[PDB]
Curated annotation (Swiss-Prot):
Binds 1 [4Fe-4S] cluster per subunit. The lineage of its organism: Bacteria, Thermotogati, Thermotogota, Thermotogae, Thermotogales. It is found in: Cytoplasm. Keywords: 4Fe-4S, Cytoplasm, Iron, Iron-sulfur, Metal-binding, Pyridine nucleotide biosynthesis, Transferase. Its main location: cytoplasm. It comes from Thermotoga maritima (strain ATCC 43589 / DSM 3109 / JCM 10099 / NBRC 100826 / MSB8). This is Quinolinate synthase.
Length: 304
């Protein structure tokens, strides 16, 4: 409209004027995706974090990813519009729990999903995202691993690798991706030639009835090789916008409406304000950056 127009225009002028690059996750609102310089999944954001040139980064997503960007760029400025933008699943794994399980299952490497606190990362042998979890866990020599905080992704990794995956905490899961399998049954009836794509954070019954299971970055690539007219999408609602923009020739139907309240905390208004004030800076203890970069870089080493 007219008010969003002023905010958009200023964001683009200020970003240019101040030497910011704006990076956004796929679950950000459409209006912020549209103003970002790079929108992608966690893995793509991590790779982008290593190769960008700008000295200042405005990050639009949740805290753990902003902090990852910072860990890989300790001498650049990283700001976020809202510091409370967090991943509730991630926050239930603690350093005390990792220590507990390391003592309970000595020998086993600790693999942490990128949705994890930066302090938890310092204790990990290696980090993974949904895109590379299976690959990463295969290259570890141990046949037993400790994995968290997502039980669903861990269980997915166990199925694919055949390795024993001890998940922590007890019931770590993403509430956004708790779709009902009956939704897939229903959509099969309504659109019998649609392809169903879901995230590995979804529960097993949902995963098992999908045509494709993958990270949101992987989702965005499936239509490059699958000619299907209709795709049904089991991830957070913001992905629909991204998909529709990439492939205007196809139809994208949410499996169900699912919203990450934390991802929606960034708005045009607080994004503009962030560029105006150059705040809030992402700041981490030096020790945490030193100790956490290890398993993050290990992830890229075990990849290809
Ligand atoms: S969608 Fe789920 S896993 Fe991703 S940030 Fe939100 S609560 Fe965390
Ligand atoms: Cl395939």
């Amino acid at each position: 409209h007219h008010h969003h127009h002023h905010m958009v225009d200023e964001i683009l002028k200020l970003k240019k004027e101040k030497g910011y690059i704006i990076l956004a996750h796929n679950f950000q609102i459409p209006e912020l995706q549209d103003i970002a310089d790079f929108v992608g999944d966690s893995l793509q954001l991590a790779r982008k974090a290593m190769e960008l040139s700008e000295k200042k980064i405005l990050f639009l997503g949740v805290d753990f990813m902003a902090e990852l960007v910072k860990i890989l760029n300790p001498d650049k400025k990283v700001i976020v519009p809202d510091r409370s933008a967090t991943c509730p699943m991630a926050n239930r794994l603690t350093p005390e729990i990792i220590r507990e399980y390391r003592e309970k299952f000595p020998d086993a490497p600790v693999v942490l999903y990128v949705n994890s606190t930066s302090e938890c990362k310092t204790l990990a042998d290696v980090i993974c995202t949904s895109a590379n979890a299976v690959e990463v866990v295969k290259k570890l020599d141990s046949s037993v691993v400790i994995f968290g905080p997502d039980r669903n992704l861990g269980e997915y990794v166990a199925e694919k690798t055949g390795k024993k995956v001890i998940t922590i905490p007890e019931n770590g899961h993403c509430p956004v991706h708790q779709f009902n399998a009956e939704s897939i049954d229903a959509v099969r009836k309504k659109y019998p030639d649609a392809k169903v794509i879901v995230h590995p954070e979804c529960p097993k019954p949902v995963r098992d009835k999908a045509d494709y299971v993958g990270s949101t970055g992987q989702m965005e690539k499936i239509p490059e090789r699958d000619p299907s007219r209709i795709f049904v999408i089991g991830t957070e609602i913001g992905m629909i916008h991204k998909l529709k923009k990439k492939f205007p020739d196809r139809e994208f139907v949410p499996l169900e409406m699912a919203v990450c309240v934390n991802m929606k905390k960034n708005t045009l208004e607080n994004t503009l304000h962030a560029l105006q004030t150059e705040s809030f800076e992402v700041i981490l203890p030096k020790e945490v950056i030193e100790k956490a970069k290890k398993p993050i870089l290990r992830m890229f080493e075990l990849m290809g």
